[PDB]
Enzyme design. Sequence first.
Site, PDB file in Angstrom:
ATOM      1  N   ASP B 181       1.287   0.487  -2.384  1.00 13.91           N
ATOM      2  CA  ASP B 181       2.120  -0.532  -3.068  1.00 13.91           C
ATOM      3  C   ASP B 181       2.944  -0.223  -4.044  1.00 13.91           C
ATOM      4  O   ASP B 181       2.822  -0.586  -5.123  1.00 13.91           O
ATOM      5  CB  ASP B 181       1.162  -1.614  -3.215  1.00 13.91           C
ATOM      6  CG  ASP B 181       1.969  -2.977  -3.778  1.00 13.91           C
ATOM      7  OD1 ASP B 181       2.936  -3.132  -2.990  1.00 13.91           O
ATOM      8  OD2 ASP B 181       1.573  -3.614  -4.726  1.00 13.91           O
ATOM      9  N   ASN B 431      -8.121   5.937  -5.206  1.00 14.23           N
ATOM     10  CA  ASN B 431      -7.633   4.504  -5.551  1.00 14.23           C
ATOM     11  C   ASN B 431      -7.754   3.620  -4.175  1.00 14.23           C
ATOM     12  O   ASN B 431      -7.001   3.837  -3.098  1.00 14.23           O
ATOM     13  CB  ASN B 431      -6.326   4.203  -6.114  1.00 14.23           C
ATOM     14  CG  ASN B 431      -6.109   2.757  -6.283  1.00 14.23           C
ATOM     15  OD1 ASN B 431      -6.587   2.099  -7.069  1.00 14.23           O
ATOM     16  ND2 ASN B 431      -5.246   2.278  -5.439  1.00 14.23           N
ATOM     17  N   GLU B 432      -8.636   2.799  -3.963  1.00 15.40           N
ATOM     18  CA  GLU B 432      -8.847   1.858  -2.976  1.00 15.40           C
ATOM     19  C   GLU B 432      -9.060   2.488  -1.573  1.00 15.40           C
ATOM     20  O   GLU B 432      -8.358   2.185  -0.855  1.00 15.40           O
ATOM     21  CB  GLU B 432      -7.774   0.738  -2.969  1.00 15.40           C
ATOM     22  CG  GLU B 432      -7.606  -0.087  -4.136  1.00 15.40           C
ATOM     23  CD  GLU B 432      -6.754  -1.089  -3.972  1.00 15.40           C
ATOM     24  OE1 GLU B 432      -5.612  -1.169  -3.241  1.00 15.40           O
ATOM     25  OE2 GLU B 432      -6.917  -2.391  -4.862  1.00 15.40           O
ATOM     26  N   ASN B 490     -11.339  -3.012  -8.492  1.00 11.57           N
ATOM     27  CA  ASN B 490     -10.159  -3.797  -8.315  1.00 11.57           C
ATOM     28  C   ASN B 490     -10.381  -5.322  -7.797  1.00 11.57           C
ATOM     29  O   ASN B 490     -10.832  -5.146  -6.724  1.00 11.57           O
ATOM     30  CB  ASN B 490      -8.944  -3.128  -7.539  1.00 11.57           C
ATOM     31  CG  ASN B 490      -8.783  -1.830  -8.228  1.00 11.57           C
ATOM     32  OD1 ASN B 490      -8.873  -1.464  -9.461  1.00 11.57           O
ATOM     33  ND2 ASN B 490      -7.957  -1.162  -7.515  1.00 11.57           N
ATOM     34  N   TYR B 492      -9.115  -9.610  -7.143  1.00  9.99           N
ATOM     35  CA  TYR B 492      -8.071 -10.482  -7.382  1.00  9.99           C
ATOM     36  C   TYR B 492      -8.419 -11.702  -6.929  1.00  9.99           C
ATOM     37  O   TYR B 492      -7.742 -12.494  -6.061  1.00  9.99           O
ATOM     38  CB  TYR B 492      -6.970  -9.894  -6.406  1.00  9.99           C
ATOM     39  CG  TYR B 492      -6.135  -8.714  -6.853  1.00  9.99           C
ATOM     40  CD1 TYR B 492      -6.610  -7.498  -6.750  1.00  9.99           C
ATOM     41  CD2 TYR B 492      -5.130  -8.871  -7.709  1.00  9.99           C
ATOM     42  CE1 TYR B 492      -5.962  -6.517  -7.170  1.00  9.99           C
ATOM     43  CE2 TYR B 492      -4.516  -7.755  -8.116  1.00  9.99           C
ATOM     44  CZ  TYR B 492      -5.020  -6.564  -8.152  1.00  9.99           C
ATOM     45  OH  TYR B 492      -4.439  -5.361  -8.609  1.00  9.99           O
ATOM     46  N   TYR B 496      -5.417 -13.370  -4.284  1.00  7.69           N
ATOM     47  CA  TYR B 496      -5.498 -13.155  -2.679  1.00  7.69           C
ATOM     48  C   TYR B 496      -6.520 -13.735  -1.902  1.00  7.69           C
ATOM     49  O   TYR B 496      -6.385 -13.704  -0.668  1.00  7.69           O
ATOM     50  CB  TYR B 496      -5.605 -11.239  -2.552  1.00  7.69           C
ATOM     51  CG  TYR B 496      -4.382 -10.549  -3.002  1.00  7.69           C
ATOM     52  CD1 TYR B 496      -3.021 -10.793  -2.497  1.00  7.69           C
ATOM     53  CD2 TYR B 496      -4.470  -9.517  -3.672  1.00  7.69           C
ATOM     54  CE1 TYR B 496      -1.851  -9.956  -2.844  1.00  7.69           C
ATOM     55  CE2 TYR B 496      -3.228  -8.699  -4.304  1.00  7.69           C
ATOM     56  CZ  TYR B 496      -2.291  -8.727  -3.556  1.00  7.69           C
ATOM     57  OH  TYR B 496      -1.202  -8.182  -3.887  1.00  7.69           O
ATOM     58  N   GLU B 527      -8.186  -3.143 -11.759  1.00  6.46           N
ATOM     59  CA  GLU B 527      -7.134  -3.985 -11.633  1.00  6.46           C
ATOM     60  C   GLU B 527      -7.619  -5.394 -11.596  1.00  6.46           C
ATOM     61  O   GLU B 527      -8.709  -5.570 -10.943  1.00  6.46           O
ATOM     62  CB  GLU B 527      -6.371  -3.303 -10.216  1.00  6.46           C
ATOM     63  CG  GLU B 527      -5.690  -2.183 -10.216  1.00  6.46           C
ATOM     64  CD  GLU B 527      -5.089  -2.022  -8.777  1.00  6.46           C
ATOM     65  OE1 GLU B 527      -5.019  -2.850  -8.109  1.00  6.46           O
ATOM     66  OE2 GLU B 527      -5.000  -0.852  -8.510  1.00  6.46           O
ATOM     67  N   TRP B 572      -3.885  -5.252 -13.935  1.00  7.97           N
ATOM     68  CA  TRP B 572      -2.708  -4.898 -12.901  1.00  7.97           C
ATOM     69  C   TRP B 572      -1.568  -5.840 -13.205  1.00  7.97           C
ATOM     70  O   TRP B 572      -2.006  -7.205 -12.946  1.00  7.97           O
ATOM     71  CB  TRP B 572      -3.203  -4.786 -11.400  1.00  7.97           C
ATOM     72  CG  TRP B 572      -2.025  -3.808 -10.799  1.00  7.97           C
ATOM     73  CD1 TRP B 572      -1.446  -4.501  -9.903  1.00  7.97           C
ATOM     74  CD2 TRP B 572      -2.034  -2.431 -10.669  1.00  7.97           C
ATOM     75  NE1 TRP B 572      -0.684  -3.418  -9.116  1.00  7.97           N
ATOM     76  CE2 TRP B 572      -1.084  -2.123  -9.664  1.00  7.97           C
ATOM     77  CE3 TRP B 572      -2.527  -1.301 -11.449  1.00  7.97           C
ATOM     78  CZ2 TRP B 572      -0.552  -1.005  -9.533  1.00  7.97           C
ATOM     79  CZ3 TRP B 572      -2.101  -0.372 -11.148  1.00  7.97           C
ATOM     80  CH2 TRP B 572      -1.079   0.175 -10.174  1.00  7.97           C
ATOM     81  N   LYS B 591       3.205  -8.143 -10.873  1.00  5.57           N
ATOM     82  CA  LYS B 591       1.985  -8.509 -11.593  1.00  5.57           C
ATOM     83  C   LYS B 591       2.244  -7.795 -13.054  1.00  5.57           C
ATOM     84  O   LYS B 591       0.988  -7.972 -13.771  1.00  5.57           O
ATOM     85  CB  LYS B 591       0.817  -8.007 -10.800  1.00  5.57           C
ATOM     86  CG  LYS B 591       0.484  -8.681  -9.582  1.00  5.57           C
ATOM     87  CD  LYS B 591      -0.945  -8.307  -9.112  1.00  5.57           C
ATOM     88  CE  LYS B 591      -0.988  -8.875  -7.532  1.00  5.57           C
ATOM     89  NZ  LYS B 591      -0.280  -8.468  -6.493  1.00  5.57           N
TER      90      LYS B 591
HETATM   91  C1  LIG Z   1      -4.261  -4.605  -2.520  1.00  6.30           C
HETATM   92  C2  LIG Z   1      -5.051  -4.631  -3.743  1.00  6.30           C
HETATM   93  C3  LIG Z   1      -4.117  -4.855  -4.631  1.00  6.30           C
HETATM   94  C4  LIG Z   1      -3.268  -3.603  -5.039  1.00  6.30           C
HETATM   95  N1  LIG Z   1      -4.115  -2.707  -5.547  1.00  6.30           N
HETATM   96  C5  LIG Z   1      -3.537  -1.273  -5.735  1.00  6.30           C
HETATM   97  C6  LIG Z   1      -2.184  -1.528  -6.318  1.00  6.30           C
HETATM   98  O1  LIG Z   1      -1.538  -0.101  -6.138  1.00  6.30           O
HETATM   99  C7  LIG Z   1      -1.288  -2.782  -5.948  1.00  6.30           C
HETATM  100  O2  LIG Z   1      -0.064  -2.567  -6.785  1.00  6.30           O
HETATM  101  C8  LIG Z   1      -2.477  -3.834  -6.060  1.00  6.30           C
HETATM  102  C9  LIG Z   1      -1.461  -5.189  -5.854  1.00  6.30           C
HETATM  103  O3  LIG Z   1      -1.258  -5.684  -4.588  1.00  6.30           O
HETATM  104  O4  LIG Z   1      -1.042  -5.690  -7.046  1.00  6.30           O
END
Ligand SMILES: CCC[C@@H]1NC[C@@H](O)[C@H](O)[C@H]1C(=O)O
Lengths: 620, 620
Positions: B181, B431-432, B490, B492, B496, B527, B572, B591
């Site tokens: 992203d 990351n993720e 992370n 949300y 989300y 995040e 984030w 964000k």
């Molecule tokens: C999909 C989980 C959230 C996502 N996590 C990694 C970041 O690189 C993104 O910017 C963040 C977002 O969508 O804001």
Amino acid sequence: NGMLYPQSNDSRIVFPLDGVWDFRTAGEDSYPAEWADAPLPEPLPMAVPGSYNDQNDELNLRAHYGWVVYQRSFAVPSRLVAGQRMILRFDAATHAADVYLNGQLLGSHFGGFLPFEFDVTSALHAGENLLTVAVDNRIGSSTLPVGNDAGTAFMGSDNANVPAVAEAKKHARRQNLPNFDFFNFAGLNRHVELYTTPADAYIADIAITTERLDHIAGDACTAANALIAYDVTFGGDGRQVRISILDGEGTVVAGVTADIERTAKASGEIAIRDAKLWNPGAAYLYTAVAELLPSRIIDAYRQTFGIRTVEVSGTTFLINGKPFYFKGFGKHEDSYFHGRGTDDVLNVKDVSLIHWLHANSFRTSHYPYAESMYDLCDREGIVIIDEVPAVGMSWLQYANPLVAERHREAIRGMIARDKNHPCIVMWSIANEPGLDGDGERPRQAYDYFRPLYELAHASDPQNRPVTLVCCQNDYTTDITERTMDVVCINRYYGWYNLSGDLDAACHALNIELDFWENIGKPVMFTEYGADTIEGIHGTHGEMFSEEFQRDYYARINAEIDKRPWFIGEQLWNFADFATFQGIIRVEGNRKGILTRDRQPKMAAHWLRERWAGIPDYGYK
Amino acid sequence: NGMLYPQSNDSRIVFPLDGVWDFRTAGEDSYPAEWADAPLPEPLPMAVPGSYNDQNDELNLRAHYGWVVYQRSFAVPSRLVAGQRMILRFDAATHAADVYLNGQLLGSHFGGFLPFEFDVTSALHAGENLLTVAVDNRIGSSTLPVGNDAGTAFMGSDNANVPAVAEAKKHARRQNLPNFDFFNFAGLNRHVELYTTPADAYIADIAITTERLDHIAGDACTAANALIAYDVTFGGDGRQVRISILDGEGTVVAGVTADIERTAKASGEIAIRDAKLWNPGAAYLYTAVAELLPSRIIDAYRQTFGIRTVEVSGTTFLINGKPFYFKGFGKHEDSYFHGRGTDDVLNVKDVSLIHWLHANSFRTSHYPYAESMYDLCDREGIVIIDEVPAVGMSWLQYANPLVAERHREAIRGMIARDKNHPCIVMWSIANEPGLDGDGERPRQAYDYFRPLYELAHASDPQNRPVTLVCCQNDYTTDITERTMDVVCINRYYGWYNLSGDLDAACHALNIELDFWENIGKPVMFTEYGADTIEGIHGTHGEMFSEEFQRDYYARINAEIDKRPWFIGEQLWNFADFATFQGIIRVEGNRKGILTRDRQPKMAAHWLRERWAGIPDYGYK
Ligand SMILES: CCC[C@@H]1NC[C@@H](O)[C@H](O)[C@H]1C(=O)O
Ligand SMILES: CCC[C@@H]1NC[C@@H](O)[C@H](O)[C@H]1C(=O)O
């Protein structure tokens, strides 16, 4: 069946009940009935006509689930009600209402966007009367518009695989989960008025139709002869009704006295020589004056109408025998404080903006609009596609008898209310229902929607074309849309798919257009567009920029211009509007070519320029 | 292995090659080889350092797929190169590069965010030299960061069931499809420079570590004794190196002469009495001066370092024995014209903003940053979590040997480059990535990531804690995250999922927190947040309003304050940044608590106020 708008004349009076009412929120699935017996305790003010949701920033009425209760008092002179039939009319209560007068339950209603009324002749008394109206905002699997019984709203985001989310979900505050993409504004959205008729006998309904046109002029301004029909229904109880046709100047150009035959009803035809026709961009209106005879007059009603024919022929849409092309948009009844509340200042302005844009049409997405808007478009030469609140339907609904009956009620009610408007040229029986897929689903959808197609044709004395607005779907397994009189499609190539890639979007669009070319029906856009935040700019326009919205319409319209059978372009949307909150809704829906304050984005200017060069007749 | 930043002194000179270069776009999978042999035909200007994508509005370089070619000329005095080892260094070429000097291939590199260099001693000649650099922007299933070989970009929209879409896709213009992203900014994102060392023998690498602290003062400003270790590697070919320790004022506080043992290396320990420690909010820096002896000096390098220990103990994160609490955010190297290009004006400003917010830390999401930023945070007392570009990974990658090798390369390269920075307290190896699910997937993820965890510990002479930043997932089936030294999550909730419902969001959060409470690891946010368009306001803040972002952090932070084992809050994001276009990206990712122009949203003020009352040490 008839729901003629209340009229004041020598035998009838209208007493509006609009203004600042008393108001209380109530329960998720109940309200205190005894509130109908006395003044509401500790009431809030609530202006009506109007949504209640944005009328109190101390509370969060947008989050409200279930019932609210309106109340006001009123008094009228006894000498005025004396001997009269007293009718209490609600132009719209969204979505459902229980109505009380002086503690008596008058009855209930569910259709949230169509008027209903009660005979309160016996319920009225002298001095102050106490009017209590409970309004239910709840939507679900059995309402139109459709709500979801669990889960998420549209284009709602979820992480269902997270155990904590699934668990928290079960204890979350109860909310309406819409089956549609606009906010669930509720309350007394339109006018409330008490009105009077004579008691013994009265005009209950009027239907005027344009039956035939002889020798239409080249410019369609006139026909040498127009044959129109009248159908007047009566209530109450060798009786007669006099019918006078008044032209734009008030001149009686035709007149007949007809016999009332018994449901008492009088019906016939009237020939009008050199009749001046109603056209888009060139409206002309007559008045059919009905007078119930006993030289004195018992009852009267003045019904505006316009003389014009509508006929689908092959791949053409003929108005007065002329090949019409739709230029316009889907709208919403939506504005900052009123919500879904009717606002005639805004209606007048919006109609002027439709003129400014050089558009000629819109659709009442996704519910019948306030009646005044139709009157306005009657006099302003703007064509309307009239649509019921059947939005959010899928197969869960088709098997539901209550839903089916409410759908039939909406169609019959809409057409009963709006039949006389010349501006209306087509009925829409649904927006974006589930129609495609495999197994028996397409057939189930077809079997559900065909009798509604047939009902719309049977209910409309003018027998206008009937459509169903189709979501972006697998058009190859959809077997319903292709059977409508006009194919109305919502397509978002380049936005919801092939995102930002306009070349690919146009390629895909052209593939589906090749499909529809073989179907052999007239086809139009009823939705297409792109969310756009005013002030976001790029030299190479990306999604959400003004430039991208502009480029979007330029490319797509360039493609549909190549198809002679493509008879209209209605985009989404006229103006930004409020939705349920979500990750794809930037302060609501931003696919408006105008802002919510009706200010023009770049795309609006571009479209204005394009539409200025496209004629109502003969473009294709 | 060593990649010491080029330094100018009595034995070394640096000649920067930044400025306005020549530039041409090339093919999707090739470029003309003769472009390396002669001046580029019809070149465009392109500033270096900087991403190329936003440096030409006549073209749409954001849409570019494949190769571009940079070129410039340079000349240096013959007397400067005489007898010297000449090295051409690229701080970063994103993502892959072929480098040519005077028509000769010097070599190639993959990895867009770490430096590489070539010995150009023999390829150089007198007068003008022609330097040609081909840069490849392509991402896919085997690159880090990870691209998708087909379909849609990360968090993209689709209507795959529509045949026209499926068909149009097959013929669409080729694009990089990021599984991440943030926008795929490419080119010479960081500095290019020629530099000099002695040829016969030279300093190739330096590692300084804080081995032990004896009797740290109560305020952690000093320790009675600090034992530090040095490890100096040499290139080239009874030799010795002198190591002098300089304090903040340039005073020699310690010094030793060590023997060089042969892979030439000198290694040892130095004790420093009354050592001044490096702390968050109170930086102190020493310089280790290494001088290769033959009174004359053969070679020299000045290596900055800070004296401090890092230790995870139970559920605490101890810096110099004090329980630290992270306050901050993930950042991006992102700005309006530079793209991913390094900008030290912006770094200085951002560091000042970190101070303004009373934050103390950030993570280099999602790639190693420019070296100057680490130097800056060294002198400014800001703590860093250093992260490799291993973003967008799933099970497709874990079975790919090339991916595994590139991952090991990124870890080893990052740590080799950044080991000496006192500000760095933890490594993030991804990351993720996909870690959860059923069957063998959690085990496969575990087996992929454990050796990388071990590699990060073995590569770092300081042996800092190692983490993996975990996406919102099923924490009950994830068996990898819980094995990290610090649990970095992370989440949300309320954005989300459970969208707009902060009560439900906090409830769900507390359920997962109840899960982590028993794990017995220290846990922090890396995040959490909400897209926010500055200027959108509401009395009851809905998603995208400033108020909602504010409310979001207020509620969530109120919940984590109740957990003693929760040792940090990195949100984030620091600032709005550019992404691939899509229906959830309103001119990129919004964000940021600051706008892309580094202006504070309401949430920034609230967070500033909160963080002002939270101490770096002893909060929990
Ligand atoms: C999909 C989980 C959230 C996502 N996590 C990694 C970041 O690189 C993104 O910017 C963040 C977002 O969508 O804001
Ligand atoms: C379902 C996708 C398109 C959708 N169509 C119906 C409208 O009521 C929505 O506003 C519009 C949108 O999402 O903009």
